[PDB]
Amino acid sequence: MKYILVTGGVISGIGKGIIASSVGTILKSCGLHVTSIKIDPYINIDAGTFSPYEHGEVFVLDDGGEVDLDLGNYERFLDIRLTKDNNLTTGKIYQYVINKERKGDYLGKTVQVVPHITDAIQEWVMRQALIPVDEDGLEPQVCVIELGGTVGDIESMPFIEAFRQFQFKVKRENFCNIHVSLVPQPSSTGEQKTKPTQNSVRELRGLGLSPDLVVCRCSNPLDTSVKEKISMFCHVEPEQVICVHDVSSIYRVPLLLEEQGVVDYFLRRLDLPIERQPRKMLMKWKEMADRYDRLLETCSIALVGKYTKFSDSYASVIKALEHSALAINHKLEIKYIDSADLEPITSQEEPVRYHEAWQKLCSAHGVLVPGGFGVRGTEGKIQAIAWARNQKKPFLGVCLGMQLAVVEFSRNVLGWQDANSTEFDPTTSHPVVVDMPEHNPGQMGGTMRLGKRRTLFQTKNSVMRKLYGDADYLEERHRHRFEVNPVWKKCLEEQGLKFVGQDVEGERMEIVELEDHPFFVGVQYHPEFLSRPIKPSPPYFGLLLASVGRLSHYLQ
Amino acid sequence: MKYILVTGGVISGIGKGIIASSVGTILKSCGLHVTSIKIDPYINIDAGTFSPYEHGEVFVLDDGGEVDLDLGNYERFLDIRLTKDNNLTTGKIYQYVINKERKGDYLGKTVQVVPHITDAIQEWVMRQALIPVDEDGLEPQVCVIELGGTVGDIESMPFIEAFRQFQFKVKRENFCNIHVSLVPQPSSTGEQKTKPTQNSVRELRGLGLSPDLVVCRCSNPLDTSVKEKISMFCHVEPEQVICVHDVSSIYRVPLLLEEQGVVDYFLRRLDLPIERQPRKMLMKWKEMADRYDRLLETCSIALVGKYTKFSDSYASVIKALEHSALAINHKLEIKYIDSADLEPITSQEEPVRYHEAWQKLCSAHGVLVPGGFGVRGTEGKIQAIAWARNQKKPFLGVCLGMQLAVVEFSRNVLGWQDANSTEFDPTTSHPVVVDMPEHNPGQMGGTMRLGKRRTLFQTKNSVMRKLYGDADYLEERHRHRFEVNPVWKKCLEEQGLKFVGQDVEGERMEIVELEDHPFFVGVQYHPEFLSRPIKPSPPYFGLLLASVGRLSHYLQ
Amino acid sequence: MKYILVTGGVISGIGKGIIASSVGTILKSCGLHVTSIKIDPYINIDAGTFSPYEHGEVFVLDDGGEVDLDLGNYERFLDIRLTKDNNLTTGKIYQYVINKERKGDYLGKTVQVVPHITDAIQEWVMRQALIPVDEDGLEPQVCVIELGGTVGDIESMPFIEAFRQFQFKVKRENFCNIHVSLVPQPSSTGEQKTKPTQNSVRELRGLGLSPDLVVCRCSNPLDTSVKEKISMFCHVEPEQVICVHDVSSIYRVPLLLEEQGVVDYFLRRLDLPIERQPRKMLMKWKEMADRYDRLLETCSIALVGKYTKFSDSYASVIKALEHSALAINHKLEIKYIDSADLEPITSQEEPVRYHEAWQKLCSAHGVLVPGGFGVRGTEGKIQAIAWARNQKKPFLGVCLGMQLAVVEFSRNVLGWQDANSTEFDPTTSHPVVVDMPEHNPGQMGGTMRLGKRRTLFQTKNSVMRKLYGDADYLEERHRHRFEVNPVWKKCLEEQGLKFVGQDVEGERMEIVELEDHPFFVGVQYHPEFLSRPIKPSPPYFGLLLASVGRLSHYLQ
Numbered sequence A, B, C: 001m002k003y004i005l006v007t008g009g010v011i012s013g014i015g016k017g018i019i020a021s022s023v024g025t026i027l028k029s030c031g032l033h034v035t036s037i038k039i040d041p042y043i044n045i046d047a048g049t050f051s052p053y054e055h056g057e058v059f060v061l062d063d064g065g066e067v068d069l070d071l072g073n074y075e076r077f078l079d080i081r082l083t084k085d086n087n088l089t090t091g092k093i094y095q096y097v098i099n100k101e102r103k104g105d106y107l108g109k110t111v112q113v114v115p116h117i118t119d120a121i122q123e124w125v126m127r128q129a130l131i132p133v134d135e136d137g138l139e140p141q142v143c144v145i146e147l148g149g150t151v152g153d154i155e156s157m158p159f160i161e162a163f164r165q166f167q168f169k170v171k172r173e174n175f176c177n178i179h180v181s182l183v184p185q186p187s188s189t190g191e192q193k194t195k196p197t198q199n200s201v202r203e204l205r206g207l208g209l210s211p212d213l214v215v216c217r218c219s220n221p222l223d224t225s226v227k228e229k230i231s232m233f234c235h236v237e238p239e240q241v242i243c244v245h246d247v248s249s250i251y252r253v254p255l256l257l258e259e260q261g262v263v264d265y266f267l268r269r270l271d272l273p274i275e276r277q278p279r280k281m282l283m284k285w286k287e288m289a290d291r292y293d294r295l296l297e298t299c300s301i302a303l304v305g306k307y308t309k310f311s312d313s314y315a316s317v318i319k320a321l322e323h324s325a326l327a328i329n330h331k332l333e334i335k336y337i338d339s340a341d342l343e344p345i346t347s348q349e350e351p352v353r354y355h356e357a358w359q360k361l362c363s364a365h366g367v368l369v370p371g372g373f374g375v376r377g378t379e380g381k382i383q384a385i386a387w388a389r390n391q392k393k394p395f396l397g398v399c400l401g402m403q404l405a406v407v408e409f410s411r412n413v414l415g416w417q418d419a420n421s422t423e424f425d426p427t428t429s430h431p432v433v434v435d436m437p438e439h440n441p442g443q444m445g446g447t448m449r450l451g452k453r454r455t456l457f458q459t460k461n462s463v464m465r466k467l468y469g470d471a472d473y474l475e476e477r478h479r480h481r482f483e484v485n486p487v488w489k490k491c492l493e494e495q496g497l498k499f500v501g502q503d504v505e506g507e508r509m510e511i512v513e514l515e516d517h518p519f520f521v522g523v524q525y526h527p528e529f530l531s532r533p534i535k536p537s538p539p540y541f542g543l544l545l546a547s548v549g550r551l552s553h554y555l556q
């Protein structure tokens, strides 16, 4: 199998990820079945531990694996669904070698980093590369491997070494290496300076790998004499001296690499089954990018936050909204609102923030109410929901936004004001939302409803069923344990909120809609993770359709 | 607390261990309470997995820890008893950090090698340095840390980094570094060449440490101009350019370092409480070394082997015999004999080896019969035992040598030829030796009788009790699970073999002696691990006393 | 003697020069006698070869040495006059060692880079540091040494090695090292990234030096956590982690380093005779900087060029004008004009450039006409001179601008249109300007009038004599060989141009002025090289005085 290892030379920030994703995208566009693996030199075995602030979102796979948000990029650039094992980590590798020592798979020899850890890397890469990622059964042709960290770091050492050995195991006509490095230009001279590229590539071959492609970060398009200076250090022709100024969108990066002529070089080196064709389906992607730069019209809508500021806390959410907004042909505006200060105590005790938050909320012609854990802002988000309902604004509740949409309707519509969750308020008189973890054999204790599960539509009348394509059921990714209590469902039947989706077991109600309102729905799954730039996730699409006012027309 | 980190520059073979041990020995001789830690960059958490051929012997601590044979060196050079934690390993460090991540001790941050693994090293070193190793309660003054592997290796990277940071945590007046490197002389020119010292020390300060002492391996005593060339590269005066030609014994290495003047430099740098004294107890050690070079007289005696050749398979055993032989004022000769070819099948099928083995066994005026596991040679060693008994030769059975001494007496003396073990021959009609593992609360399944246990003498009449000092009981290190069955003890009472030692529980018989023979005993513990060069272990001493013929006189 | 070696870590562009100059300036401001040396790892022995375009201007010393423009910076920041030997170059060092080999100063030993080249560096640094640079006779207290190139480059290797050895020769309380490195912030995250500082300092101690100060380039003021991250890599407290965002002027850099507290650290490390004083004369420099940021009012004036664009071709010239303009309290505007296209052929053949040049020349309320060599634009600059004379605009002719001021007055005023130079037009019928090189004993052939020479005023009536302070003579730096022919001086006596300055020999006329004009003068020397920011050079001052219209008042 062919392999592309992507590494970084100077600093970690250089966006190795978008490079690797873009090379993958192009090879997919050439009709090749491409798989991708990411190495995260960190100790964490999985993503599950992460608090979303400091490292970001947690992504979820079809198999139920919690993984890095960087894997989600590979899933949105390539039409693929990853298994947990295409995230390789230091924690995973060391843990697996540790386990093999205990078993005695090592025959009572000493276990060393070399060869033993390095062999573990090579077995894993081979094994995972083989697994079919696309819908198609046949095995993949190329594997794009992205290695995190920078050459010279301690964390990366066992991986670079493994790849030094790997380049021999996989033949030369099968291995290739892309190195990304920085060509910094000081503001004064403006000269795109060469030195960091020189030293890092020296370091790399002192580790044992050598660049087959060189990727060159800048603020601006590159000089030829600069590329010729790079060429002179690094054995390489300027046409493999690929360069990347910062640009308007991630969607452009694969377009830029096509302009840079990378395909011809991979046909030349990797002997690829890309037969040469005058048209390839990339023309569609070119049209989409050309449409993206054109876009004009607005609608201010809110995302209801709990953290102090967006960094990565809503990354897939914002992308799902953006996919929808492009399909809608509108610019999204995301009005970030901390709800934890719209609540009464801080309404009095920081009144500047309180009026500011209401002024943002009065700009929203529609609201997204995403998920949550713990109690941070959990008494505040309820005001944006109630506002959307009473102001008749388009609404989508996601995970905890759905649990809060049930509680608020009980509090305000039913008159069941005593009603509350089990997360916050575990003392509650009438616990409307209760802990209900999944339990299975071979497992100890209750566990989170995590990963893809089938949710089945109760009735035909649903808007979500229509947006879904009038299919009988859907399969969507979950990550929770709190559910609406099944006993209390009865109180709802008389009134206008209705459960439209339920679990196959029947135990859990997973979608709700409010009648006599333009659009108002809540879901227990996380539709963001299933969104793709070619086709948005239907719930986000429905919200944006509704926010512009297109919804009624769309159904037609 | 003061710290001495000992590292290697060029190759691993340079005997960093004997250096570190010798520095420890000297500081102990100056009246300082010295502790020692060893870092083994290998993945193995503990020694227990090792098959003794490829990595050597397994050492046992007072706490029951299985550790490297290199820790045993620190225990014989310094009058100390180590806990398992003064062996630090990559496996131990990574495992402990992994566990802390699962607990959430990391507060949902990412866990990285730096700072997290590096902090784990620093907490461990501090914590262990504090624990009292000597009999005295008060904490140690200096900790000698030996780091395995060579600078520049991947395995050592997290430790060198930890020590770079550590040099700041512990003040300059508390940290010091010894670097050992090689001054190779080609046979032709004979010139003690400098280059490897130069590059490795460059590498070291590129890692962040700098030598405070430089230790210089050679075949021959060093030139001044060579030391001045080293000095010019490495910022250092020739008096810190310590050198080590290969020498006659390990016992000399601390003598050579005293000649090299190391004490004065540690007083100068580490501000040590060594008050200056004209005599220190090292004069005794000087006498012992001077006696060691004098020694003359022989006795050929056998060690009964199962492996094809000695490397390290009997290392503590041979040292125990040597301690005894020095106290006896005789040169030891160890006649290594593979018993697995004295048995009948190979007696016929490789007759050259069979006659060779008997010619060795006919040289033995006494025999040591050490322990064993599995079935390799287990039908052969029985012939050396029977030979010693019927030839009336001085004998010591150790672990499996004791189990075989019980079985043979049953087979030949009792006429219970049906008698056999449970290890080999699990089908046995009359299982004389049976699996009896120790069982305790908080443990799952049976486990090995491992570590120090108290064995109590049944009677006064014992030779071993006399060699022990007429004490009521002893405490000695075990590593087994097979014992003589307690039911079958009755058959013995009539005849000349007698059990002189038993467990406190009473469940297990742990020492045996045969009457009407010059010296013939077996033990379930491993007395080697308690031997020290100043005072041999009594069972080995008794064997050598008996082999020379001194025994009868010694008791007087 | 104390030494400060200044080196660079990441890239050459980081302005090591302004750092080194600024440290020098501060120590001078503390009353210390400071000398400075620069190492230029280039092969060129001297500056003389350089064509000013590609490497810049050529600077001239009092002794007649042609040196780099970077030495001129040390002369304008410190009130000092350098000898040729405080420029050390690879060419100079290798040449001197080569010469010593030929002499046999090496006693027939082999000559090697180490020790021999490295010793040559150490002798030179010691020797030069000792020479008095200030007017004062007593030797210097501190020597600031700037080393060009970046750590890790081949060119710098013999110098870093010399300094590794030198740190021992000069005691620790006498050597210190400043390392400058880059903390690049990408536009997206804005994070002031650490990695390049880490690697370069590792490289440096792998060369053998270690930073005593760390200087940190950025676009913006630094974060504390970033400095603490740097500190953790490089053994150093954040108060030695000095930082430098880009700023408005070079004059601010020493102010920023005072804010950064560098003085206290040099008192602490270098034990300096700075006695502690509450006021030091730096208050004047603070006032000057505060005045510099205030400045408002303009006058558009031209510099008449021959090259296509300013880079460094007029660097000291522009500084001299700027010193004058600050003393004048006006912003300078330098209108750069290529004269090589105001001439008739290109006036017709590139008419866009011709009209553009005249539009610039019509903006000029005064003109500077700097020097030249060869024939580039030599038929064009004559039009700006004639324009200034006939338009009655303030004028200064420098070197070739003076030779052209003589020729034009002959051509247009005298009617001696046949008159021309010997440089261009060597066929000339009446050679008004002729080659007259200086000749001396011990020299072969004629040579350039190069370096300081005394020019004596012919009469009292001169404006330049008044601007000079009514002194009898001046001493100014020359670099030429063409002079006005002495025979043709007679033609001038009747008319309004007059020679006011002449050589001591009497052979050469060196200053001219035109009567009945607001200000119009030419000089054979280069007054820029004598200008200082505290006191401008009088001819440039006179031009700016005249250009604003202040001149008449100034004399009062």
Ligand SMILES: Nc1ccn([C@@H]2O[C@H](COP(=O)(O)OP(=O)(O)OP(=O)(O)O)[C@@H](O)[C@H]2O)c(=O)n1
Pocket: A008, A012, A013, A014, A015, A016, A017, A018, A019, A021, A022, A070, A073, A074, A077, A149, A250, A315
């Ligand atoms: N396939 C990808 C890759 C990146 N991104 C966007 O780019 C950012 C991350 O850029 P990346 O290419 O991962 O580089 P960095 O994360 O900046 O640095 P690294 O080189 O460590 O990846 C994310 O916010 C994400 O929205 C994306 O949308 N799709």
Ligand SMILES: Nc1ccn([C@@H]2O[C@H](COP(=O)(O)OP(=O)(O)OP(=O)(O)O)[C@@H](O)[C@H]2O)c(=O)n1
Pocket: A011, A012, A013, A149, A150, A152, A153, A154, A155, A156, B112, B113, B114, C192, C193, C194, C195, C196, C229
């Ligand atoms: N000698 C070192 C230093 C750091 N790291 C790794 O560096 C990673 C952080 O990457 P990056 O942000 O690129 O490094 P920083 O140290 O934060 O430097 P910068 O300020 O340039 O980000 C951490 O996971 C850590 O394990 C490493 O492997 N080896």
Ligand SMILES: Nc1ccn([C@@H]2O[C@H](COP(=O)(O)OP(=O)(O)OP(=O)(O)O)[C@@H](O)[C@H]2O)c(=O)n1
Pocket: B008, B012, B013, B014, B015, B016, B017, B018, B019, B021, B022, B070, B073, B074, B077, B149, B250, B315
């Ligand atoms: N305190 C010590 C140290 C070493 N030895 C002897 O020396 C040998 C090991 O030498 P060592 O000092 O450990 O160096 P090497 O093992 O050769 O190499 P390294 O530097 O990795 O230790 C062992 O066979 C052991 O008998 C000893 O008796 N006592």
Ligand SMILES: Nc1ccn([C@@H]2O[C@H](COP(=O)(O)OP(=O)(O)OP(=O)(O)O)[C@@H](O)[C@H]2O)c(=O)n1
Pocket: B192, B193, B194, B195, B196, B229, C112, C113, C114
């Ligand atoms: N960093 C260094 C050190 C030394 N040399 C060169 O090393 C040569 C001497 O070679 P060799 O004898 O191999 O080195 P020694 O320093 O003498 O070391 P050794 O004791 O191993 O000979 C000299 O010409 C000197 O220029 C060098 O190029 N670079």
Ligand SMILES: Nc1ccn([C@@H]2O[C@H](COP(=O)(O)OP(=O)(O)OP(=O)(O)O)[C@@H](O)[C@H]2O)c(=O)n1
Pocket: C008, C012, C013, C014, C015, C016, C017, C018, C019, C021, C022, C070, C073, C074, C077, C149, C250, C315
């Ligand atoms: N004492 C100084 C030093 C520098 N400069 C100005 O700064 C520029 C050069 O900056 P410098 O400090 O020499 O750094 P660079 O030349 O950019 O790079 P290097 O680090 O190689 O010097 C020159 O144009 C000069 O006008 C100055 O006026 N006075």
Ligand SMILES: Nc1ccn([C@@H]2O[C@H](COP(=O)(O)OP(=O)(O)OP(=O)(O)O)[C@@H](O)[C@H]2O)c(=O)n1
Pocket: A192, A193, A194, A195, A196, A229, C011, C012, C013, C149, C150, C152, C153, C154, C155, C156
């Ligand atoms: N391995 C190398 C490469 C280059 N140089 C030196 O680098 C100097 C040029 O400095 P700089 O401009 O900093 O290097 P560039 O190669 O031009 O790189 P950049 O594009 O970053 O300027 C030259 O004098 C050359 O002798 C060196 O000493 N060693």
Ligand SMILES: [Mg+2]
Pocket: A015, A016, A017, A070
């Ligand atoms: Mg990434």
Ligand SMILES: [Mg+2]
Pocket: none
């Ligand atoms: Mg350059």
Ligand SMILES: [Mg+2]
Pocket: B015, B016, B017, B070
């Ligand atoms: Mg060892």
Ligand SMILES: [Mg+2]
Pocket: none
């Ligand atoms: Mg040599």
Ligand SMILES: [Mg+2]
Pocket: C015, C016, C017, C070
């Ligand atoms: Mg400079």
Ligand SMILES: [Mg+2]
Pocket: none
């Ligand atoms: Mg970082």
